[PDB]
Structure formats: C-alpha cells, structure tokens
C-alpha cells in the first residue's frame, strides 16, 4: 500500500521508458599548408651556346 503496488508487488504505475539521447555522427575536413621556394643559385656560365 505504501509503495502503491498490487497484492504481489507488481507496480500500479507503468515505468516510463526513458528513451535515450542516442549517438550522433562525426565529421572530418581537409587541412592545407604553404611553403616557399629555394634560393636561386647563380648558374655558372659555360662556354656553349
């Protein structure tokens, strides 16, 4: 009587389902980087044409 059950202890009020929050999806993206050139070496002038 105190816990509001039946004669055999079965609950008189149906327990709520408590539907979960459920998982979510994941995402990824691209990443870039930048660089410069190398020092220009003075070409040793040959004799050819």
């Amino acid at each position: 009587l105190r816990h509001n059950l039946s004669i055999d202890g079965q609950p008189l009020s149906l327990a709520i389902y408590a539907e979960p929050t459920d998982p979510k999806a994941l995402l990824t993206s691209m990443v870039q980087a930048s660089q410069g050139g190398s020092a220009v070496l003075p070409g040793t002038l040959s004799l050819y044409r």
Binding site: T44, S46, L47, Y48
Partner: protein, 49 residues
C-alpha cells in the same frame, strides 16, 4: 642521375685550353743537346756508310 652529374661537372669545369703549336728540328735539338751534342746529318751519313 649519375649521367646528369657527369654532364653538370663537364659543363661547369669546362675550360677552353690555350692551344700552342711548336716546331722542333731534330738536327738542332741533337746539336744543342745538353748531354750528347752532335751533328745529326753527319751521324746519319756515318751510320748509313
């Protein structure tokens, strides 16, 4: 890559060398020899005789 390295070394260390032509007379060389100075045509005629 080895061939390109060879070509690079060739075309960098290439140097047009000075070309010199010298005329040498055997008779005068033998006549002005430091050690055994002698007449070339005289010795030739002696050896032929």
């Amino acid at each position: 890559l080895n061939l390109a390295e060879m070509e690079k070394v060739w075309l960098e260390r290439d140097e047009r060398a000075l070309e010199v032509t010298r005329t040498v007379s055997l008779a005068q060389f033998y006549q002005a020899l430091s050690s055994d100075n002698f007449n070339l045509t005289e010795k030739l005629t002696q050896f032929l005789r």
